[PDB]
Amino acid sequence: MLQQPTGGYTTLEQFAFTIRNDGTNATPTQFLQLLSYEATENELVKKTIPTPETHLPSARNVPGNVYIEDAITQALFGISAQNVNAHGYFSRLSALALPNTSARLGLDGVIYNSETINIPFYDPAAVANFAATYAKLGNASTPRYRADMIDIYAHVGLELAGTDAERAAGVMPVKRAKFDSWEGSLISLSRDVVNWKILAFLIDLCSLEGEALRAFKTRNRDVFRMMLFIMSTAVAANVVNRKVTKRVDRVLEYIGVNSMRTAGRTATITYDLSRHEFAAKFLQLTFTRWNA
Amino acid sequence: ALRPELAFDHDHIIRCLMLAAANYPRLEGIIVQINTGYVASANVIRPVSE
Amino acid sequence: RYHESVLEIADIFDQADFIQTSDAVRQLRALMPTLSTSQIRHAIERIAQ
């Protein structure tokens, strides 16, 4: 069992989040610097996120080792992820929510019903806090619990492209993102992100409290923003290169506005409706935790 | 739902049409022949012997 | 005392959009016999053929 550092698991060099920038390793923060925005006549306004349902999916036992980290990261970032709303994984997740469960979350991101001494794992109290919220991702498909797939993206825009004054104001112009880019910059970015060990991020988001938690929110804002960016490319209505001088600028119109596009396209990973339900529910839970 | 084909090149097709309109006498009657066929296929007007 | 040489338009214009060629095509044209307009039509009719 890995002890959780007062700053959270994300402090560990084992859990560093990084992305290739035209192939060279770089922190997400030094990628987000490349991004620049052009405002338009429409205006995003972030009305409050409805509070998530208390109802966790039932903790039915399932055969095998659920690969929950890969499940979530693929549902959010992977190319054409499938079976994202299949119920078994999140049922085991809710089993992790229990006060004295036998189940364990490996640093690998797998869940093992065995105590499994050979494989290092997160502190069970922390994953209890984390599963207690993220098991709700299993509610993403059920009609009673579907998250607003549209309005939540306003928050995404604000947390990504929003200037500090707009982030205070809660209202920002809809923006058109652009950056100097390479051949498959968005796909390669989604590859670089889908490999992220996000459960460190989420477990830290749920387990930490007070000053350590707020310091986590400042220390990791760029990470959260990169996941937000990959989702934004997934939901952007339109994405196109613009040839400025010899440089090629990728241009995503528009940030913060989910087009509900589902057909695949070359430029970016694409959400089927199941991925929209999932991503929207994830954003509900994550933005709720992020704003507290 | 993307179709694996090139975009219809407006800026080029219009240019080639101008070059053709400059050099190709047939072009007028080519285009007419489409429109004429369409009139005929809309079955909008027919002669009578009366 | 001069040195004659080709100068690509790219070397003077920073506006890349209106530049489709280079020294190459001029160098090719140097190889071509001077062409009466009738010969030009013959060439075009042949490439068409």
From Swiss-Prot, chain C:
Location(s), subcellular: Virion
Chain coiled-coil ranges: none
Quaternary assembly: Homodecamer; each decamer is made up of two conformers of VP2, called VP2A and VP2B. 12 homodecamers assemble to form an icosahedral capsid.
Family statement drawn from the similarity comment of this UniProt entry: Belongs to the turreted BTV-fold inner capsid family.
Job description of the protein: Inner capsid protein that self-assembles to form an icosahedral capsid with a T=2 symmetry, which consists of 120 copies of VP2, with channels at each of its five-fold vertices. This capsid constitutes the innermost concentric layer of the viral mature particle.
Protein known as: Inner capsid protein VP1
Lineage: Viruses, Riboviria, Orthornavirae, Duplornaviricota, Resentoviricetes
